[PDB]
Amino acid sequence: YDYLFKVVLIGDSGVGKSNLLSRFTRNEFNLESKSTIGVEFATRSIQVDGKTIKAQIWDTAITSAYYRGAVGALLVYDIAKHLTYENVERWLKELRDHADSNIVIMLVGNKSDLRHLRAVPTDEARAFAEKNGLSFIETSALDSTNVEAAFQTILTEIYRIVSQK
Amino acid sequence: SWLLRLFESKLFDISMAISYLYNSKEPGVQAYIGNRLFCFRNEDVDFYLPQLLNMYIHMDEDVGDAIKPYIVHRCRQSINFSLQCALLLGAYSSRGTKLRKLILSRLAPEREFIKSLMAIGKRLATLPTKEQKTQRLISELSLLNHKLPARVWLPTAGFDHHVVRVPHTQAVVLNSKDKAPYLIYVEVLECENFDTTSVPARIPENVALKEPWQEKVRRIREGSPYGHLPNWRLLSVIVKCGDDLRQELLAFQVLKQLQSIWEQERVPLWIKPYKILVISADSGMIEPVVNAVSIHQVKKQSQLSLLDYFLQEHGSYTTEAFLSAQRNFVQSCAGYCLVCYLLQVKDRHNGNILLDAEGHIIHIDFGFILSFKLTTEFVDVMGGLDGDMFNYYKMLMLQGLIAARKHMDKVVQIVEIMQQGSQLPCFHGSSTIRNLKERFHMSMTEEQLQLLVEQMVDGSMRS
Ligand SMILES: CC[C@H](CO)NS(=O)(=O)c1cc(-c2c(C)nc3c(NCCNC(C)=O)cc(Cl)nn23)ccc1OC
Numbered sequence: 090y091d092y093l094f095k096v097v098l099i100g101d102s103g104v105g106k107s108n109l110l111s112r113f114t115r116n117e118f119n120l121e122s123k124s125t126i127g128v129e130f131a132t133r134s135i136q137v138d139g140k141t142i143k144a145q146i147w148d149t150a151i152t153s154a155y156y157r158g159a160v161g162a163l164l165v166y167d168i169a170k171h172l173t174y175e176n177v178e179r180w181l182k183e184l185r186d187h188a189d190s191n192i193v194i195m196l197v198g199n200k201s202d203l204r205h206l207r208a209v210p211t212d213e214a215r216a217f218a219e220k221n222g223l224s225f226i227e228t229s230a231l232d233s234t235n236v237e238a239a240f241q242t243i244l245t246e247i248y249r250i251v252s253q254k
Numbered sequence: 255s256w257l258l259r260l261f262e263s264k265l266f267d268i269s270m271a272i273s274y275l276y277n278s279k280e281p282g283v284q285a286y287i288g289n290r291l292f293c294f295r296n297e298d299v300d301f302y303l304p305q306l307l308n309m310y311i312h313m314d315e316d317v318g319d320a321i322k323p324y325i326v327h328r329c330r331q332s333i334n335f336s337l338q339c340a341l342l343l344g345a346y347s348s349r350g351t352k353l354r355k356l357i358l359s360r361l362a363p364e365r366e367f368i369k370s371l372m373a374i375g376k377r378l379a380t381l382p383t384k385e386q387k388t389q390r391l392i393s394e395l396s397l398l399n400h401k402l403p404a405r406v407w408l409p410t411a412g413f414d415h416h417v418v419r420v421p422h423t424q425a426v427v428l429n430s431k432d433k434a435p436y437l438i439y440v441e442v443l444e445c446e447n448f449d450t451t452s453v454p455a456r457i458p459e460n461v462a463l464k465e466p467w468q469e470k471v472r473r474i475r476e477g478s479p480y481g482h483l484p485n486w487r488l489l490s491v492i493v494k495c496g497d498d499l500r501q502e503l504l505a506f507q508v509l510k511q512l513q514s515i516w517e518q519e520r521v522p523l524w525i526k527p528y529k530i531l532v533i534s535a536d537s538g539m540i541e542p543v544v545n546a547v548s549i550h551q552v553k554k555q556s557q558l559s560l561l562d563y564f565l566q567e568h569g570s571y572t573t574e575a576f577l578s579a580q581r582n583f584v585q586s587c588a589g590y591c592l593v594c595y596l597l598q599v600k601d602r603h604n605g606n607i608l609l610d611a612e613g614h615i616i617h618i619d620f621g622f623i624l625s626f627k628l629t630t631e632f633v634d635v636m637g638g639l640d641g642d643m644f645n646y647y648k649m650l651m652l653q654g655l656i657a658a659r660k661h662m663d664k665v666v667q668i669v670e671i672m673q674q675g676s677q678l679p680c681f682h683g684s685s686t687i688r689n690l691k692e693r694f695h696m697s698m699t700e701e702q703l704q705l706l707v708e709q710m711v712d713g714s715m716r717s
């Protein structure tokens with residue numbers, strides 16, 4: 090009711106953007122995967138410091154360009170496929186250019202449940218994570234881990250913009 | 255969640271895993287299963303190694319990346335596993351190569367040990383008689399004891415061990431062919447873990463005849479330097495220097511599954527899968543069945559008919575020894591007939607069937623399958639066409655068939671995956687699996703199966 094937060098989910102295809110949203114927004118998961126064609130949102134309202142907010146999350150045919158007025162972005166990579174981690178640099182360059190130059194960003198390593206097939210160490214990511222002005226949680230959409238936390242981090246992160254006189 | 259529902263149930267086994275892995279095009283599922291392999295017992299997954307590695311070679315990169323991690327993990331905790339991978343990786347590619355060299359990368363002793371052994375076999379090629387081959391074998395094997403203490407092992411052994419000694423005087427060559435295979439006996443000291451132990455200390459060196467297996471161990475033990483130790487055991491392998499065993503391996507898995515199926519259900523058929531090892535896709539080893547010899551040689555030394563030999567070796571039909579042997583015969587006949595039928599084996603003769611001391615038969619050569627005769631000599635041992643025991647033979651076949659239908663997919667799975675990018679002669683048809691499925695007659699009623707079994711047997715008798 091009080092605020093409307095525009096948030097984007099971005100990342101390479103296959104990283105789990107669409108299943109995070111389904112976990113977070115409807116608490117549903119599926120191994121079978123219909124590619125997202127272009128764009129989705131789904132929506133859920135939460136309460137921070139006794140205030141009613143509403144998060145509008147947009148999942149993502151390169152030109153989505155849907156960023157504008159996009160205050161927050163969850164940038165996701167698949168921990169079990171190193172290449173998805175490699176393009177995070179290219180995902181932060183295209184970020185600035187077609188998207189708000191002061192957007193709140195959280196980096197997300199998804200598919201944390203694949204412990205034994207892990208191909209991207211938490212430290213290398215978190216190192217790059219704290220080296221630059223990004224957030225750093227690790228999630229598993231499949232076993233509903235850190236999913237609420239991830240959103241509520243960025244939303245709390247987001248909230249602290251009040252900047253009053 | 256409906257998929258994930260299944261995967262999280264008790265219903266999830268390695269069998270199911272591979273099936274979804276082979277068919278599913280969803281990479282999210284593939285990777286999920288790749289990870290779930292680790293939770294399973296090492297033992298259950300091992301049986302499927304030939305399938306897994308084949309996929310790695312011949313399938314999309316997507317599939318491979320899901321598979322590789324588990325393989326490497328096993329390789330690091332077991333050199334045996336490492337070995338078998340490297341051998342298999344190579345044979346099935348003539349993608350693979352990149353991973354093989356990484357695995358071979360310490361393990362040096364074993365690869366020479368194997369190479370030497372074949373090199374021996376290829377050498378016997380210039381000597382044109384069976385007996386001549388045998389003499390050279392014993393001599394050249396004697397040279398192996400010089401490195402005999404070794405720090406190498408037989409992958410074909412049920413367990414971890416070190417090879418200590420080759421009783422070269424006991425070794426024999428099995429035929430007169432140009433690149434004839436040869437059987438050898440090997441002494442070993444059992445381990446609890448190969449990877450974590452010493453190599454034993456040498457014990458210095460100081461007759462060969464036709465005899466049962468347990469008597470042969472006695473004689474060798476008494477003769478062996480290491481024989482006093484409790485750790486000491488005798489193994490044996492047959493060496494094929496110039497023959498492909500990949501078709502043979504395929505049959506083994508099928509035999510092992512059918513064996514388990516009839517075990518899970520309560521069908522008292524009897525069969526004996528013998529372990530197979532693939533070295534080059536030109537060369538291999540076999541773990542032999544002990545206490546058995548070919549029908550043909552059994553007929554040449556006895557000068558008897560099959561029944562008479564039974565009577566000679568076990569007793570009058572009033573004895574336990576005979577009736578037990580008869581029971582063991584019949585159960586082994588139904589098993590192998592079904593296997594021959596299911597796999598459509600061809601070229602069935604008394605050179606390819608072994609007889610053990612308790613009365614089971616054992617088919618041994620599985621070239622010419624996919625893409626069995628009942629001679630009156632066999633029917634006689636059963637007490638004749640009107641016999642109850644012969645009827646029972648038919649009864650077992652039906653029972654074993656009804657059981658087999660209930661598990662058809664487990665069998666076809668093993669086979670269907672191996673066709674994958676395959677240049678084996680048994681896969682020439684596009685049909686080939688499709689025809690195989692028809693042979694289970696899944697559509698048929700049991701009454702229909704009763705009739706089909708009768709017809710099969712009648713056909714099997716014409717000769
Ligand atoms: C050996 C390979 C050569 C070709 O490379 N072809 S083969 O000789 O015909 C042959 C024999 C066997 C076999 C097995 C598992 N167990 C015994 C066996 N067991 C008896 C050994 N021990 C005693 C005590 O009798 C005897 C024999 Cl002759 N063969 N055999 C298996 C496959 C096979 O390939 C078709």
Ligand SMILES: Nc1nc2c(ncn2[C@@H]2O[C@H](COP(=O)(O)OP(=O)(O)OP(O)(O)=S)[C@@H](O)[C@H]2O)c(=O)[nH]1
Pocket residue numbers: 100101102103104105106107108109119120121122123124125126148149199200201202203228229230231232280281282283286
């Ligand atoms: N083990 C595990 N697998 C996941 C997880 N999230 C997604 N997967 C898999 O990743 C794949 C994601 O497909 P999808 O539904 O299209 O999401 P996406 O990442 O946004 O793909 P897209 O960017 O091309 S729209 C699915 O196969 C899905 O099963 C997770 O958290 N844990």
